[PDB]
Amino acid sequence: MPAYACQRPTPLTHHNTGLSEALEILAEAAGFEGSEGRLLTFCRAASVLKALPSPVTTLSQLQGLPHFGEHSSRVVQELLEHGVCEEVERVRRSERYQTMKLFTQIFGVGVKTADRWYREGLRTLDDLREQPQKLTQQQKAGLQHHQDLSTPVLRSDVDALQQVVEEAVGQALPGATVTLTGGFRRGKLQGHDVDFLITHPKEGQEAGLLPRVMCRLQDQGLILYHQHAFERSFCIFRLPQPGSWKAVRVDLVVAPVSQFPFALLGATGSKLFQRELRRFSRKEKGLWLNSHGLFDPEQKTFFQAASEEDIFRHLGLEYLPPEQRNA
DNA sequence: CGGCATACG
DNA sequence: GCCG
Ligand SMILES: O=c1ccn([C@@H]2O[C@H](COP(=O)(O)OP(=O)(O)OP(=O)(O)O)[C@@H](O)[C@H]2O)c(=O)[nH]1
Ligand SMILES: [Cl-]
Ligand SMILES: [Mg+2]
Ligand SMILES: [Mg+2]
Ligand SMILES: [Mg+2]
Ligand code: NA
Numbered sequence: 001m002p003a004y005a006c007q008r009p010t011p012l013t014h015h016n017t018g019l020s021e022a023l024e025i026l027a028e029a030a031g032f033e034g035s036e037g038r039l040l041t042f043c044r045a046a047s048v049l050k051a052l053p054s055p056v057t058t059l060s061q062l063q064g065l066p067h068f069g070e071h072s073s074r075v076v077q078e079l080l081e082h083g084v085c086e087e088v089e090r091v092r093r094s095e096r097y098q099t100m101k102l103f104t105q106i107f108g109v110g111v112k113t114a115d116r117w118y119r120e121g122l123r124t125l126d127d128l129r130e131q132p133q134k135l136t137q138q139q140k141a142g143l144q145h146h147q148d149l150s151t152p153v154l155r156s157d158v159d160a161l162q163q164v165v166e167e168a169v170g171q172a173l174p175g176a177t178v179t180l181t182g183g184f185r186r187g188k189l190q191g192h193d194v195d196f197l198i199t200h201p202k203e204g205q206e207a208g209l210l211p212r213v214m215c216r217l218q219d220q221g222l223i224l225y226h227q228h229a230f231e232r233s234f235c236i237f238r239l240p241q242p243g244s245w246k247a248v249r250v251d252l253v254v255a256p257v258s259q260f261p262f263a264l265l266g267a268t269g270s271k272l273f274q275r276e277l278r279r280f281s282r283k284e285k286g287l288w289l290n291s292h293g294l295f296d297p298e299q300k301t302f303f304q305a306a307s308e309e310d311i312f313r314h315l316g317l318e319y320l321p322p323e324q325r326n327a
Numbered sequence: 328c329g330g331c332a333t334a335c336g
Numbered sequence: 337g338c339c340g
Binding site: 003030034037038039040041042044045066067069070071072163 | 337338339340
């Protein structure tokens with residue numbers, strides 16, 4: 001089992017779901033307390049289990065697996081022996097964890113804002129609604145729409161949305177294309193949002209595109225919230241429903257076609273997969289990877305890529321299709 | 328021990 | 337919390 005998640009296939013569904021879920025609770029809790037290192041280790045240990053070909057049934061099966069030391073092994077040992085890990089259950093019921101989860105789940109609220117509100121004594125969404133002078137417009141939108149944004153987006157919802165984005169993109173710039181990215185591209189059946197990547201086959205034609213797209217969607221009454229030159233938008237869309245509608249988070253990204261493979265790779269995730277791939281690139285290959293390109297800092301050159309396959313080849317990694325990037 | 332992904336809004 |  002290789003040490004980096006980008007070196008092994010990780011499918012969406014697997015054989016150690018309960019064990020990985022428990023480790024991910026500890027990872028999430030570590031993040032809420034500011035310990036990015038502990039978050040990463042628990043995430044990485046969880047992802048190792050997702051990559052295994054069969055269920056872990058005995059503690060000896062952890063021997064030799066990367067990212068399993070005393071603490072993560074103890075968690076698995078307790079789950080195997082008693083079906084529950086006391087540390088995990090203590091986190092689950094804790095007021096700190098439940099409130100930090102509630103607050104950070106809001107669009108526009110991160111760990112630092114959540115933590116400050118927690119220390120001020122706030123605990124519930126109505127606590128926040130009862131003090132709106134403390135909220136940004138973005139947080140106000142996140143809170144107004146919180147109930148709809150807490151409802152999973154379905155694959156049926158994605159198709160209807162891609163059509164309306166394509167319509168607006170077509171008027172804004174004929175020939176521009178719309179690609180579904182994020183978790184739905186990895187095969188998820190549900191999501192917290194819908195992620196799209198937009199480009200045009202003629203380098204440079206994509207400049208200035210996203211304002212033209214957003215104004216056109218806004219004119220059609222489909223935009224419940226957006227931030228407004230720019231190339232990423234984080235929006236809330238009005239999506240039709242039987243006899244009504246619901247609010248859905250939609251992310252739009254524009255990239256020049258020269259950068260499209262890097263932007264596609266970077267937007268397809270998973271989040272852990274991309275962190276691990278970028279860590280691998282820098283630490284093992286000495287190359288700097290981001291959503292725009294791959295930089296050789298010794299030669300001071302960028303690697304031209306025509307496909308995601310090119311990027312995996314230039315990093316010396318076996319190609320993984322999106323469905324196997326569910327780290 | 329140091330390191331832990333990345334840049335735009 | 338774990339790796340090198
Ligand atoms: O912290 C982050 C968040 C996101 N991303 C990159 O942005 C993509 C979209 O980020 P999303 O937050 O939309 O996640 P997701 O689509 O993978 O899953 P859902 O929760 O939406 O169902 C991710 O897949 C990843 O590529 C990062 O690189 N880092
Ligand atoms: Cl590989
Ligand atoms: Mg998404
Ligand atoms: Mg998104
Ligand atoms: Mg230390
Ligand atoms: Na948030």
